[PDB]
């Protein structure tokens, strides 16, 4: 098996290297070792092959190396877009058998803080006829990916029926999350209004809708 660190972090401009340590009986037996980059929700992309070669089009900021029984990926002039998972890969000399490394989450520090924008949709007529009602709160474009969400029936807090996603990384390095409030049509039509409250850091954004 191939050991990589679970995660590494660096600053823009600096270089970092991710190590891929194996044995004399694999990584140190040939240089059929490669590196893959994976951004969120995407297939892995080949960055380095044969230890040190770049596929066509791949940036030259990505280099490969191999001291002893451990491979090494080095990213220079680190940029925000480099933020992703990195996997190393070995083949046996006979090229009949391959294995991947653990994976490494590369994070690029100094990303600017961003307040979320919120969209709140009321239940549609269509759903109201199905004798149901969902309020949809859409939280997008925030960083760091930590929010707390609070629903209000009028201005009374409502905890029951809330369903909130874990925030997950969009493809611009900012986060998105959603929060769903379930209630019954009567429950929806009895209150004067409902509000989804997104608090991020020093920020509170509240959006509010009405029957």
């Amino acid at each position: 098996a191939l050991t990589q660190p679970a995660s590494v972090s660096g600053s823009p401009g600096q270089s970092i290297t991710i190590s891929c340590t194996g044995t004399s009986s694999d990584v140190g037996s040939n240089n059929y070792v490669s590196w893959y980059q994976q951004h969120p929700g995407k297939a892995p992309k080949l960055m380095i092959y044969g230890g040190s070669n770049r596929p066509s089009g791949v940036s030259n900021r990505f280099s490969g190396s191999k001291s002893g029984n451990t491979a090494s990926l080095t990213i220079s002039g680190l940029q925000a877009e480099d933020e992703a998972d990195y996997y190393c890969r070995s083949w046996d000399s006979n090229l009949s058998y391959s294995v991947f490394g653990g994976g490494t989450k590369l994070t690029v520090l100094g990303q600017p803080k961003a307040a979320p924008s919120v969209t709140l949709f009321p239940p549609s007529s269509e759903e109201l006829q199905a004798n149901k009602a969902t309020l949809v709160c859409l939280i997008s474009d925030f960083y760091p990916g930590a929010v707390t969400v609070a629903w209000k029936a009028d201005s009374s807090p409502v905890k029951a029926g809330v369903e909130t996603t874990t925030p997950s990384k969009q493809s611009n390095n900012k986060y998105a999350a959603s929060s769903y409030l379930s209630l019954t049509p009567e429950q929806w039509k009895s209150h004067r209004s409902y509000s989804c409250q997104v608090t991020h850091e020093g920020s509170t954004v509240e959006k509010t809708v009405a029957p």
Partner: protein
Amino acid sequence: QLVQSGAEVKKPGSSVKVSCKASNYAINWVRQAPGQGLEWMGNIEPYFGTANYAQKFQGRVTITADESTSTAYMELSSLRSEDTAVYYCARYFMSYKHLSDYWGQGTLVTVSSASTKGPSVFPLAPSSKSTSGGTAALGCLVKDYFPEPVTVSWNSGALTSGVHTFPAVLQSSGLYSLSSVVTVPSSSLGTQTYICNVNHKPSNTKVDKKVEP
């Protein structure tokens, strides 16, 4: 270049056949359980039919090729819940005397005894007099389906920009819900057509919803 089949749901202990449609190197199969790292399974060479397996999956995985259609099949039996992963095919090729390997889009196989349920699609419309800024958000609530994934396109793909399809929430009931929004110019709000196209392969449901007008 590489096209695999749609996503699937399987009861634990069932069989799953996933295909890959396609240089003459092997057709490799790699899996990734969600949140997990990549994992090599095996490969196949279109001629002679020689196949290789990682010791782990050996026996309970059969990778086959059909040259008549340049298509490869990975079968996995004794399906256990922890088999739940995205399954890719991959194949190396040579362009600039240089290397590249094409990956399939991947197919999600979820293993659970929980029933498959196609989604309900509700339109998410703004009050018209709700939206400020020559711009408006509208969407589709894709509610109460199982298992993942769901696919949302707008106007059959013709509309592609300003389109944000959010990751699903797993509700307490054990069903997923998810939402797709388009931001659209506000002036043509109730006149332009906005249809969302929902696809949930595991139950073979397709739903088209006219959000506007």
